[PDB]
Amino acid sequence: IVGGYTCGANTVPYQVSLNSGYHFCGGSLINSQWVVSAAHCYKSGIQVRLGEDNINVVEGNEQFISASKSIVHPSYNSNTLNNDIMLIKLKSAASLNSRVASISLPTSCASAGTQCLISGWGNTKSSGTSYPDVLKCLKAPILSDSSCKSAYPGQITSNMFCAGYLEGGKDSCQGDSGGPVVCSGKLQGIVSWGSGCAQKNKPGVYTKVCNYVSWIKQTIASN
Ligand SMILES: Nc1c(Br)c(C(=O)O)c(Br)c(C(=O)O)c1Br
Ligand SMILES: [Ca+2]
Ligand SMILES: [Cl-]
Numbered sequence: 001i002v003g004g005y006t007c008g009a010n011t012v013p014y015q016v017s018l019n020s021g022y023h024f025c026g027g028s029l030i031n032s033q034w035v036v037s038a039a040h041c042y043k044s045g046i047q048v049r050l051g052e053d054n055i056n057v058v059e060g061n062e063q064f065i066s067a068s069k070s071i072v073h074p075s076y077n078s079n080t081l082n083n084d085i086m087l088i089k090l091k092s093a094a095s096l097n098s099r100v101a102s103i104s105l106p107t108s109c110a111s112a113g114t115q116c117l118i119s120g121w122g123n124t125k126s127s128g129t130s131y132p133d134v135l136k137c138l139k140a141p142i143l144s145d146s147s148c149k150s151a152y153p154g155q156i157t158s159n160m161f162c163a164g165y166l167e168g169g170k171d172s173c174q175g176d177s178g179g180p181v182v183c184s185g186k187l188q189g190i191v192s193w194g195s196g197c198a199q200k201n202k203p204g205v206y207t208k209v210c211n212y213v214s215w216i217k218q219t220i221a222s223n
Pocket of ligand 2: 052053055058
């Protein structure tokens with residue numbers, strides 16, 4: 001997160017860290033046994049880390065649970081990032097509490113101009129790199145279709161939306177990838193892609209979760 005703020009310990013209790021020996025992506029806890037992340041975050045050997053603030057220090061509210069299964073969206077295209085969503089099933093149920101909590105799935109898609117919360121442990125610089133220890137947050141509005149498509153001509157599908165600031169300096173970035181965009185208390189976006197980070201006229205692009213809730217519900221009902 002570039003240009004954001006320190007969230008505050010466990011104030012984003014659905015935020016997870018995905019760890020394969022190191023933090024590599026975020027995710028969102030949607031019930032005690034399932035995480036939503038980005039398909040481009042796929043890899044083997046994932047451990048889900050819940051209840052984190054400083055990812056490099058055991059502070060006492062963590063739960064570390066290995067993934068039993070990862071399920072990439074059947075129509076994910078890594079070239080276009082169309083359908084950039086994955087489900088991760090935990091080997092055991094998380095114990096839900098004030099600091100580890102699920103976020104609701106949408107029943108309606110979010111509106112342009114809605115102010116959302118984006119969070120993660122990704123890069124905090126727009127050029128170069130600096131990776132934080134504690135969770136960072138950004139408030140950002142959903143942009144119009146017109147602005148999103150003009151920013152990224154021929155690349156925005158109906159399964160994507162833009163959020164952030166066309167003027168630059170405030171965005172998500174690699175390492176936030178796979179993490180939440182929460183709007184009105186629902187998981188509406190997944191950190192997916194963009195050109196650099198926090199560049200003028202190149203806002204963040206987010207997987208449009210509301211398009212996937214049928215697939216999510218059916219998949220978790222059978223796995
Ligand atoms: N207040 C509110 C708004 Br504004 C929007 C929206 O962005 O249009 C949505 Br999709 C919801 C919802 O999550 O149903 C709610 Br609650
Ligand atoms: Ca920790
Ligand atoms: Cl348009």
